Design an enzyme around this catalytic site. Sequence first.
Site, PDB file in Angstrom:
ATOM      1  N   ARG A   1       0.766  -1.177  -0.052  1.00 52.47           N
ATOM      2  CA  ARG A   1      -0.097  -0.068   0.085  1.00 52.47           C
ATOM      3  C   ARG A   1       0.816   1.151  -0.144  1.00 52.47           C
ATOM      4  NH1 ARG A   1      -2.165  -3.644   3.300  1.00 52.47           N
ATOM      5  NH2 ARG A   1      -1.409  -2.635   5.051  1.00 52.47           N
TER       6      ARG A   1
ATOM      7  N   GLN B   1      -0.540   1.766  -6.865  1.00 51.81           N
ATOM      8  CA  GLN B   1      -1.944   2.150  -6.751  1.00 51.81           C
ATOM      9  C   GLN B   1      -2.553   1.540  -7.985  1.00 51.81           C
ATOM     10  OE1 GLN B   1      -3.406   2.378  -3.343  1.00 51.81           O
ATOM     11  NE2 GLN B   1      -4.758   2.825  -5.248  1.00 51.81           N
TER      12      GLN B   1
ATOM     13  N   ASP C   1      -3.084  -2.011  -7.595  1.00 58.79           N
ATOM     14  CA  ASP C   1      -3.898  -2.294  -6.051  1.00 58.79           C
ATOM     15  C   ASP C   1      -5.121  -3.033  -6.359  1.00 58.79           C
ATOM     16  OD1 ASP C   1      -5.431  -2.463  -3.753  1.00 58.79           O
ATOM     17  OD2 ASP C   1      -4.002  -1.152  -2.770  1.00 58.79           O
TER      18      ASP C   1
ATOM     19  N   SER D   1      -8.317  -2.207  -3.775  1.00 52.60           N
ATOM     20  CA  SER D   1      -8.723  -0.972  -3.819  1.00 52.60           C
ATOM     21  C   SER D   1      -9.736  -0.968  -4.899  1.00 52.60           C
ATOM     22  CB  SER D   1      -7.773   0.125  -4.178  1.00 52.60           C
ATOM     23  OG  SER D   1      -7.066   0.495  -2.921  1.00 52.60           O
TER      24      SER D   1
ATOM     25  N   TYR E   1      -4.587   4.939  18.708  1.00 57.16           N
ATOM     26  CA  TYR E   1      -4.868   3.484  18.586  1.00 57.16           C
ATOM     27  C   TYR E   1      -5.485   2.971  20.033  1.00 57.16           C
ATOM     28  CZ  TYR E   1      -3.998  -1.639  18.417  1.00 57.16           C
ATOM     29  OH  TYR E   1      -4.120  -2.988  18.211  1.00 57.16           O
TER      30      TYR E   1
END
Lengths: 368, 364
Positions: free
Chosen positions: A120, A125, A128, A131, A218
């Site tokens: 990623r 891209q 990908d 995606s 987080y």
Amino acid sequence: GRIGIPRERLTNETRVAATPKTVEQLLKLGFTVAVESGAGQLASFDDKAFVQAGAEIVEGNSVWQSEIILKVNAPLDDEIALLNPGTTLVSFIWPAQNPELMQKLAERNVTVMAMDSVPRISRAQSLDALSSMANIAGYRAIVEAAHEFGRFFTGQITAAGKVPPAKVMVIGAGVAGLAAIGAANSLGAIVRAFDTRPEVKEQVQSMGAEFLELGDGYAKVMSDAFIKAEMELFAAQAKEVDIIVTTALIPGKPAPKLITREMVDSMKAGSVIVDLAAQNGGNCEYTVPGEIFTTENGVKVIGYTDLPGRLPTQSSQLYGTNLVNLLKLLCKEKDGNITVDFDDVVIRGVTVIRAGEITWPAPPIQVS
Amino acid sequence: HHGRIGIPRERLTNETRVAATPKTVEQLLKLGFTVAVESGAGQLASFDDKAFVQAGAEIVEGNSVWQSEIILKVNAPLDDEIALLNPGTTLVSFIWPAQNPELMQKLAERNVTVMAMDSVPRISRAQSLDALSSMANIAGYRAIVEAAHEFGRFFTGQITAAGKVPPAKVMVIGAGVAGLAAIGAANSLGAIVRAFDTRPEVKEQVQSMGAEFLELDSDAFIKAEMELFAAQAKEVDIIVTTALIPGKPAPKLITREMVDSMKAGSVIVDLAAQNGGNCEYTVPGEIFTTENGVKVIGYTDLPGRLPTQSSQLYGTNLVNLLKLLCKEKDGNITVDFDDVVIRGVTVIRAGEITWPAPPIQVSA
């Protein structure tokens, strides 16, 4: 340098790893292409549309006599034996969740590139696949919702009165979420979205949606306080929206239950929920993966796990293009020859088996 | 009861609509009526008994609904329902008197008054009562929803990392109410829309929606019309066809050869299916998939596939008729035959057949 495109044999799979358009591109990279008869049929690509593009049509298992095999799903047990040594297979694999598949493919002495393992990073891209399929899923989710919904999505003034727009909440504003926001907004819905990451606010708002608001980040999102507030937000929204699209899914982990029975029971009859986390159990407690479940209060909870297979032509064209783009990295010269260069972090990332040895997982990317 | 309106559950096979919603019930009480809804009447349309009760209606079981002074329905009463109509009742529903003389006779013998929602005259001040337009509007929207559901590609053009995807191309045949709603829905999905209508006065409406009003070049007119459709079938992904006149066979405008020429995966939604369809491949009530992979959608119940919306708009049509009939808001119906709108809609008056209404000058 022959690429083989098999028909997908996982039951109910409608996608194909190449279209006539991607076949043209594959030929410009110096490969020849064989497509198994019928492979593109369910995605609306006939054998002769492939022949027009310059592919050869082959029957039976002869497609597997190829230097390169492009597929959507991983070879079934009875397809693993047809992989010949030195073949490069490119498909979804999910190595972390499938140790036994990895061992079986390794014994065949092939090179395997898992499309779920594309790093990623910005430069990958165009490759990908995750995606590509997510973007289709989010769009398709709104089509599925409009299909099941008994009202106009689109606000309008008729002679028999003013109809209000549908209200849509989208949980998770990753690629699928954003696509859903986009499709919903195009249909004129009042759209609202929640995401735990504050960075995506400005993106959500540019698409026309309201960004919903409620020790590192987080810990914050993990805390009992945040989780209580998040559940309260969803409960309140459920009471007033008509459509909910939930997208909170991490590979291999059970999906969090964000929409409880009680929230759904609070909804107006005829409302629709599209649970894009259905394959990992669903974000919604009423979800029955693979099906639409209708509650006692008349809410349709859509839990299909093959949204991309429900836009098969689009998914095959985009996924096919992802594969072309990987092959552009594998074949920099004219020329029909593949070079698996581990100095390219994208190649390193995607390559999970190399000549019979498991190379997954790749190291953390640390580039100078 | 006097001033009570009964809303029965629809009995017709697979009917999902209801003649009133919680919101129209609110409006009906504002006119001085009371309202009884038969239990479950709204269920298939996503209006549960409790939503009606919250709006002010009373829930009744089976037959009790027929003990009302007024009955609002979607479809005409069946024989066993007709027998429960009491003298002096006013019934409002679709009736279709031309196609149903026998039914007209049975209602007359009950000495009731009947308002046929298909018989609203097509003048402008009656638009708010026009149930045929309400339903056509819904059908055009829903036609596009069905097309998108069956289509295997994006309707919406889009730049993606994996390629630029062009928008779906949509041809709408007929730009009346249903055609225009199809245009509108298709536009919302980002499609490139083209439309054809024989009436040049709709040109500005179509163009104002950013759609292309297709042009041509009686047997010469039909042939040039068929040549346009044949040429457009080779280019577009979705055809919505709406050329329907109630009570008449639908013209075959899209032939088998035309469909055979289309890109695989294409979709046709044929809104004339109930009268045989504009598409030669249409199988009314079904989707038929051609050998070349085109889906021909021939549903005859597009409004029943959007039941909540259909119920709401139709139910409002009925409110607006009752607004005319109940000027004082006192729960009393007064039929005024000087108003051409009421004269048209009133097909039986207290046992006497009053259809057809005297000739009138109109629109479209």
